[PDB]
């Protein structure tokens, strides 16, 4: 199965550490987030939020930088990655008008993402999900996973790529940061 | 809303032609076809198959194809469009592990898939829906709509289609004629 629900509400396998309403409107404060691998037909009771958004196929990268990635990038659920964060962001109407080579030149050629993003592996663990096409409030869900000892460069990465071109297109971003249960 | 429903049964707002059940396992022979805005998981019980599909945004065009493309591409609804088909697809496993730059090479440099298809407008009417995010059993929902006066014509367009490059990687591929009621 492709399809994840993220569930804010008081069961969860990650405790809520802190929620930043980076842009636009926030995520309500919960105690824990609930990950499953399945869509949940509606909200628990007594949850304050679902987010849902599946796994697909490469929309930009080219097959050098999936060498690349795939060369260095960690897997998921390492013993030391006890720290996460949810980053769950939305695209304006203008970014989603433009062609595939507009993108694209927007994403790797003026804001380097990929080639900035490999700098920080293998420290950090990445997931992408797509919600736009779901009918979602946000178009991505991204997860990332690293233990304490990156939090500075993780901090940093975020930096990096606030400033970047592609980021002025980005209309709404909350940042939900975890601790493993 | 993004979501359409293709239930083949006794009812719909189209009349089912033929079904040429190209590649793979077919689609049982039904009387109509129903369209229907959004999704749904019960289809009358007098339907032998439902298909589904979202609207999304483009990805391997770029903007001076979008341009030709929209300088001369028909509407749908069109009153004289009175015949339609929709044709079902699958792709393998191999091209979907393909990165974005083979994708592409192979789409448009090795088998002109847009060139070609802009020969066919304005007489051919698109819409182009995706599915494989949905855990459906085909990739694409593809729909074409002309009247009967491009019927030689749009079937030349599948001969060329069905020798290019890219067709060497569908795997299943099924065509419901339609007619409109
Ligand atoms: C940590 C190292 C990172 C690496 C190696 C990385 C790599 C990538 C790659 C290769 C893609 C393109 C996937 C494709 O072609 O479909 C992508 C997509 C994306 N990433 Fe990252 N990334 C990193 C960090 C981040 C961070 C920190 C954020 C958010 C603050 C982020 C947000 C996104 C978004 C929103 C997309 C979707 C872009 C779109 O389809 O328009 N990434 N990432
Ligand atoms: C009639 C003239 C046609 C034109 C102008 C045309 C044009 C296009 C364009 C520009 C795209 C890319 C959209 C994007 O960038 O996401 C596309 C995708 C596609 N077309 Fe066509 N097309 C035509 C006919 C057909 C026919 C007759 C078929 C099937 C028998 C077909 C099957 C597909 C499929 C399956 C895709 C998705 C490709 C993928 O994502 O791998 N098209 N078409
Ligand atoms: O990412
Ligand atoms: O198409």
Known sequence: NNRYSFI???????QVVKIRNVLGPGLQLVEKVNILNGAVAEIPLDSAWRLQGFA???????RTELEALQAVQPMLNRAEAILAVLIPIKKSAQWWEMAQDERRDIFERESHHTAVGLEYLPGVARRLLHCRDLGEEFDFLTWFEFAPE????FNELLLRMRASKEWEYVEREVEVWLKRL
Chains 1, 2 share one sequence.
């Not at 697909?56 to 080219?62: C, D, K, Q, V, W």
Request: hydrophobic share 30%; charged share 10%; glycine share 16%.
């Open 56 to 62: 697909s196929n490469i929309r930009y990268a080219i």
């Open 150 to 153: 990156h939090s500075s460069a």
């Open 8 to 14: 804010g509400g008081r069961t969860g396998q990650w």
